[PDB]
Amino acid sequence: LLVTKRDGSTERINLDKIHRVLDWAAEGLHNVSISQVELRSHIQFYDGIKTSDIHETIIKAAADLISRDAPDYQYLAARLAIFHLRKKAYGQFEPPALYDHVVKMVEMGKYDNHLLEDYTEEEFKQMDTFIDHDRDMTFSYAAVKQLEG
Amino acid sequence: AYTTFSQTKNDQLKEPMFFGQPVNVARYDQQKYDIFEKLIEKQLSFFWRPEEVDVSRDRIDYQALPEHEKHIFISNLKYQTLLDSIQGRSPNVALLPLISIPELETWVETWAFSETIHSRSYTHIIRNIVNDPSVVFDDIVTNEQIQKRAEGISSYYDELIEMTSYWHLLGEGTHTVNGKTVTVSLRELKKKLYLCLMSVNALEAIRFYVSFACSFAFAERELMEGNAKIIRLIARDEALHLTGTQHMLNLLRSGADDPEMAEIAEECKQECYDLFVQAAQQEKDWADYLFRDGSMIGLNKDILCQYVEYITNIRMQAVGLDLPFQTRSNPIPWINTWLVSQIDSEVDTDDLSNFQL
Amino acid sequence: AYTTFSQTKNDQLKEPMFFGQPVNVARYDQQKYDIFEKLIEKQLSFFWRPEEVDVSRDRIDYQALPEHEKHIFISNLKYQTLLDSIQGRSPNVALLPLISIPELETWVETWAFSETIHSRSYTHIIRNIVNDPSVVFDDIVTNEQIQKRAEGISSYYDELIEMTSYWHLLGEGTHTVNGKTVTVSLRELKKKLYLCLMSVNALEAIRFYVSFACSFAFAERELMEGNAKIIRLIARDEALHLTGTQHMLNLLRSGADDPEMAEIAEECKQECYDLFVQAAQQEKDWADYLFRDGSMIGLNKDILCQYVEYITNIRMQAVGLDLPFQTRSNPIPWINTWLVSQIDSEVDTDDLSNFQL
Numbered sequence: 001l002l003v004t005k006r007d008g009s010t011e012r013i014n015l016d017k018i019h020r021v022l023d024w025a026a027e028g029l030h031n032v033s034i035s036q037v038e039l040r041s042h043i044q045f046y047d048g049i050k051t052s053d054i055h056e057t058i059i060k061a062a063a064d065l066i067s068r069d070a071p072d073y074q075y076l077a078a079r080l081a082i083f084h085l086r087k088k089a090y091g092q093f094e095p096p097a098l099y100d101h102v103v104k105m106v107e108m109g110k111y112d113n114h115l116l117e118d119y120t121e122e123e124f125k126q127m128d129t130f131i132d133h134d135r136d137m138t139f140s141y142a143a144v145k146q147l148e149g
Numbered sequence: 150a151y152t153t154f155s156q157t158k159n160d161q162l163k164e165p166m167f168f169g170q171p172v173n174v175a176r177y178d179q180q181k182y183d184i185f186e187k188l189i190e191k192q193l194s195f196f197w198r199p200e201e202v203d204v205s206r207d208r209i210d211y212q213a214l215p216e217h218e219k220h221i222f223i224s225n226l227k228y229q230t231l232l233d234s235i236q237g238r239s240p241n242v243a244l245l246p247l248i249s250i251p252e253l254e255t256w257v258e259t260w261a262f263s264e265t266i267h268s269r270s271y272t273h274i275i276r277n278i279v280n281d282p283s284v285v286f287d288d289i290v291t292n293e294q295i296q297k298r299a300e301g302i303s304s305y306y307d308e309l310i311e312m313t314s315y316w317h318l319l320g321e322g323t324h325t326v327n328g329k330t331v332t333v334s335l336r337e338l339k340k341k342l343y344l345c346l347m348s349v350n351a352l353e354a355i356r357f358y359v360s361f362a363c364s365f366a367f368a369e370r371e372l373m374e375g376n377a378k379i380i381r382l383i384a385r386d387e388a389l390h391l392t393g394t395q396h397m398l399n400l401l402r403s404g405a406d407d408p409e410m411a412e413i414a415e416e417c418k419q420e421c422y423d424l425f426v427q428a429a430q431q432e433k434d435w436a437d438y439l440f441r442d443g444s445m446i447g448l449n450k451d452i453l454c455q456y457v458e459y460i461t462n463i464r465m466q467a468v469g470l471d472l473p474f475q476t477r478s479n480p481i482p483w484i485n486t487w488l489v490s491q492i493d494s495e496v497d498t499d500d501l502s503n504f505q506l
Numbered sequence: 507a508y509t510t511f512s513q514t515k516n517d518q519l520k521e522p523m524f525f526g527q528p529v530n531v532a533r534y535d536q537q538k539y540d541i542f543e544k545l546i547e548k549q550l551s552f553f554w555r556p557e558e559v560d561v562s563r564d565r566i567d568y569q570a571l572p573e574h575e576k577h578i579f580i581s582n583l584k585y586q587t588l589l590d591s592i593q594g595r596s597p598n599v600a601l602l603p604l605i606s607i608p609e610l611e612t613w614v615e616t617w618a619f620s621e622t623i624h625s626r627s628y629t630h631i632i633r634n635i636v637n638d639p640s641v642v643f644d645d646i647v648t649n650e651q652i653q654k655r656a657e658g659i660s661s662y663y664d665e666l667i668e669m670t671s672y673w674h675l676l677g678e679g680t681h682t683v684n685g686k687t688v689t690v691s692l693r694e695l696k697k698k699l700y701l702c703l704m705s706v707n708a709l710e711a712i713r714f715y716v717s718f719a720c721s722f723a724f725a726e727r728e729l730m731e732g733n734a735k736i737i738r739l740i741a742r743d744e745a746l747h748l749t750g751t752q753h754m755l756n757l758l759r760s761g762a763d764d765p766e767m768a769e770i771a772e773e774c775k776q777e778c779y780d781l782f783v784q785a786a787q788q789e790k791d792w793a794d795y796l797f798r799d800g801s802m803i804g805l806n807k808d809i810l811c812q813y814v815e816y817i818t819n820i821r822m823q824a825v826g827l828d829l830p831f832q833t834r835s836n837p838i839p840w841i842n843t844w845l846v847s848q849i850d851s852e853v854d855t856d857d858l859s860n861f862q863l
């Protein structure tokens with residue numbers, strides 16, 4: 001069977017790619033289950049299934065496992081959703097430079113053009129040192145969905 | 150020597166669980182340990198037959214599985230078939246010549262019988278998912294990954310029978326058999342029983358529950374659902390079984406039944422610990438063989454090995470042994486599903502007037 | 507030596523019933539003798555529990571009985587309790603270490619298990635008619651007329667077990683055990699097995715049916731009908747049991763299963779005849795104790811003894827033994843109910859004219 005990657009290409013279905021991601025999002029968390037997320041996903045595989053739809057399903061599954069007995073699913077579902085939202089905007093996990101991004105966004109009319117008028121490339125690169133993108137790993141799932149939504 | 154009906158009238162309430170006077174009259178109006186009478190009544194109420202479960206839809210599910218998942222399922226089935234094959238005969242052969250109270254003798258015979266229903270249900274599942282059941286059955290005896298643990302498990306059973314036979318034929322003491330010296334120690338016989346019960350406890354409370362994870366992990370994917378119904382019925386019996394061996398081990402270890410037995414329990418505390426630890430490592434290596442060609446949605450080597458460490462700590466603590474693994478949360482919580490089965494309008498202004506704004 | 511899981515991969519279809527390789531894998535997709543697989547399925551379908559039977563009206567009926575009819579019933583009950591107490595454990599202890607085909611091993615465990623329900627049902631009946639069941643149970647061991655009969659049945663069981671232990675520990679041949687010479691003959695062990703099965707056949711096909719007459723004779727008078735319901739369920743099981751021992755004995759005797767066994771069967775044919783005749787002779791003596799204080803409507807010492815002679819001829823002929831008693835019609839035919847389940851007006855004058863007076 002074949003899945004459809006984010007970049008359009010296709011490769012043989014490999015569940016280890018899913019174990020890797022979930023093991024990552026559950027690392028450090030207490031009383032979470034990789035097996036639970038995969039099974040509660042009830043992910044229906046078909047030939048050519050998009051790898052993006054696969055990830056959104058395991059996000060919903062991990063998000064609905066938030067309970068009193070297992071509170072840390074709020075961070076498992078958040079880390080999965082941040083990972084999904086990173087790919088949605090950049091095509092990768094690593095965010096670009098603040099300047100390269102603002103230039104592209106101001107050019108698309110999605111940002112205000114005053115950003116380039118008030119801050120220089122030397123200043124933008126100085127604020128990219130202020131940024132700590134690992135603070136995306138301190139959100140709860142409800143926080144990430146309000147960001148995305 | 151063992152007698153099927155001892156002539157001496159003994160108060161069955163004062164007899165020990167094992168090695169006392171062989172039971173004569175089977176009465177169920179009183180018990181020394183009522184745990185076994187409750188287990189009989191509960192096992193009798195759980196009575197099921199394999200044919201009463203629809204497993205015909207599982208053939209489609211099985212053939213649709215990937216080839217490495219056919220391997221996972223069919224290997225866990227051969228191992229199950231082997232385990233409950235030993236469990237079919239052995240509790241009767243190894244324990245009946247030693248039991249000295251009626252409520253425990255009947256329980257062991259009810260326990261062993263319920264295992265034969267499990268053996269029959271494995272025949273039911275096999276003939277309903279594969280084309281030639283002979284392929285599955287004939288592989289169980291020759292298969293290396295099973296045979297290694299099969300001969301290890303049966304040894305504790307075989308040795309208890311053998312020592313029991315010498316204890317009946319010759320009696321306690323030092324003897325001579327065809328130029329060779331043979332010493333029959335009742336204390337060593339009590340030791341071989343305790344070690345056997347510990348091995349049986351790990352068989353039914355760890356080894357089988359590791360297998361239950363594989364049977365139910367397919368059911369969590371709505372696959373092999375006829376099997377799962379049968380395995381779920383088995384797990385309900387298998388819960389009663391390990392409880393029996395638990396109460397036996399604890400009654401022996403606490404010295405309630407036999408004061409000498411409490412001493413023997415402490416001399417074996419190291420052997421029993423290594424016995425359980427060996428079982429957990431064997432099931433981990435078994436998991437390494439199950440997923441060697443790939444994993445499935447919800448189950449891999451790591452997940453299953455975590456359950457091995459999880460369930461092992463629980464079982465060993467229940468029999469008073471130190472925990473060999475780190476404290477861990479349940480790595481497959483989904484398995485527990487299967488293992489345990491207009492406004493009052495009136496106003497009072499005077500009451501409101503009692504108020505200063 | 508006996509092993510709970512034999513290492514050898516053997517064609518279980520070609521093994522003999524007994525003394526072959528101990529069974530390893532319990533499979534039920536094939537049988538050498540399908541009689542035992544059919545016996546298993548039928549015994550599993552007859553599964554009943556004693557508590558599901560209404561016996562509350564039996565307390566009043568029993569206490570209303572005359573003193574001598576209380577004696578008949580409670581004595582026939584104690585004898586039943588003793589017989590199915592032996593039958594609960596003995597087929598497991600005496601036959602399981604010897605069986606070498608799986609369908610027979612599982613049948614013996616199913617057979618023995620169904621006997622444990624009988625033992626539980628006797629406890630159910632006893633505790634529902636008497637005030638202190640301890641009085642009834644404690645008499646079984648001390649009563650002279652019952653304890654005497656226990657030694658006759660258990661001897662064939664005990665002797666087979668002991669010889670079985672020597673054959674497992676030492677093997678066949680001449681040995682020396684603590685200054686004594688001990689010769690272990692497999693032909694003598696096969697001889698001890700056959701004689702034991704003959705005694706069990708006489709127990710289940712003659713001795714118990716003598717008891718069935720007493721339980722049902724009270725029911726024909728609409729008394730103790732809760733007991734009768736249970737005894738009828740037991741008799742339905744007891745029909746399967748004697749069928750099992752019949753097929754074992756006949757397969758052995760014909761040499762079909764073991765050619766050597768056909769020879770041994772003829773050497774015992776006189777022992778087996780005297781074994782059955784003695785059993786019938788013993789039940790007659792038992793009838794004398796039931797009616798020593800008086801008889802009841804429909805049953806006395808003579809009536810029951812005629813049934814002993816009647817039922818003995820049937821069973822002995824079924825196992826290839828000569829008939830010891832005279833041919834007789836069934837003296838209690840009622841027992842078989844319990845053991846098995848506008849004128850047409852037209853006239854034709856022309857046709858009448860075709861007639862000469």
Ligand SMILES: Nc1ncnc2c1ncn2[C@H]1C[C@H](O)[C@@H](COP(=O)(O)OP(=O)(O)O)O1
Pocket residue numbers: 003004005006007011012013014015017018021051052054055087
């Ligand atoms: N061959 C495959 N089969 C099944 N799932 C896969 C897969 N490759 C990746 N995935 C999973 C892992 C991720 O949780 C999810 C998408 O993550 P990603 O790394 O952004 O996608 P991709 O690797 O397709 O670019 O899909």
Ligand SMILES: [Mg+2]
Pocket residue numbers: none
């Ligand atoms: Mg990827």
